[PDB]
Design a protein around this ligand. Structure first.
Ligand SMILES: Cc1cc(C)cc(-c2nc3ccccc3o2)c1
Ligand SMILES: Cc1cc(C)cc(-c2nc3ccccc3o2)c1
Lengths: 114, 114, 115, 115
């Protein structure tokens, strides 16, 4: 139900081997680790969770943009990109969190489908 | 070798049934029709051309954003979105022209891969 | 030294009355409240801090996009937009944090100048 | 009534010395040259036209992004960014055409105000 896709606006390519961490907000308002991985050669990270586990709640997707740029020998602005949203059962069932990265800028969009 | 993908930033969905026209720049500097179609339920338009036909040159991808918004009952700013680029044989072989649409704004990125 | 500007991609206008909260990473790694305000009729928020107070650190600029959208009758996707960055680590700079908002998408850019 | 502002997403700065050509659709459906200029050190281009001259029409703002990038040693993807819109068809408005540039990506937003 959750996929993350990352693109590099400088090179016009997927952003490969980017670390991504997902957290779920706990009842005490802290962020608890939920799932993680590294984007593939296609810039995608699949397999993070299951329908059973991805219950309604507030989630945060943290994308390690700084390490990505540093590996390319480029100084970037942000520490990371963070995407924070509520998962809602009464909306479509599949969430794609997309991010488009530049050194001093990023875009993120949610594509929510059935 | 050429795919076009269009997303709707207002609804968080693919932009479906969007008309797309591709032109190739002729020797006399006019734009000649090259290929066209409508985006699918996934917001994608595949099958526009072939490797044989997609020779080096300057191409323009025109996305009929205004009709898309009007069909949703929303007044938009732009007449269309236009993406103009040179196809280069010494780069990767597959070009994805992506567009992210809002009523008063759009983003476009090229993802060029092997 | 720190300004925030927010635009609305739906209406083609400044995003007015957007709440913004700034935090700074403390020595204990918690996010300490640093400054807050709301965007004006121009979509800008000025006067958050001073060059004396805006020391080196890791800052988080939280833009309350959900609270903004709900008021135009849009149930938007994100809770807020968070912009996290190291500031002033090569000496004082001026930072503009710009954000462009749509209900299911946003972008943010930093413009950094050396006075 | 017509301003263009351009930012560079790579450097986190205004995009300076960017050429901009504006055209207007003529009665014969050709693109007639309307105004041109270059962005300043602030990334802004002011003074393109006057409210008298900026009549209703379909306008195209061509931003010469390739010419810009080639100079920072980036071979970029696009030839230019084209922004095409109907203006002033409900009476005079003020238009800001903003663009955010990366070598393989750009975004553009319009801010439209009624004086
Ligand atoms: C935030 C943003 C900006 C742009 C120009 C494109 C996209 C985008 N999001 C995508 C999700 C799936 C496949 C292709 C996609 O392209 C996302
Ligand atoms: C992150 C972003 C993306 C785009 C296409 C535009 C802006 C933007 N933010 C602006 C604030 C004041 C004047 C012009 C502005 O343009 C900010």
């Amino acid at each position: 139900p959750l996929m993350v896709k990352v693109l590099d606006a400088v090179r016009g390519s997927p952003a490969i081997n980017v670390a991504v961490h997902v957290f779920r907000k706990a009842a005490d308002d802290t962020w608890e680790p939920f799932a993680s991985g590294k984007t593939s050669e296609s810039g995608e990270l699949h397999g993070l969770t299951t329908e059973e586990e991805f219950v309604e709640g507030i989630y945060k997707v943290e994308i390690d943009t700084k390490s990505y740029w540093k590996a390319l020998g480029i100084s970037p602005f942000h520490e990371h990109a963070e995407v924070v949203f509520t998962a809602n059962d009464s909306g479509p069932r599949r969430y794609t969190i997309a991010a488009l990265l530049s050194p001093y800028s990023y875009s993120t969009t949610a594509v929510v489908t059935n």
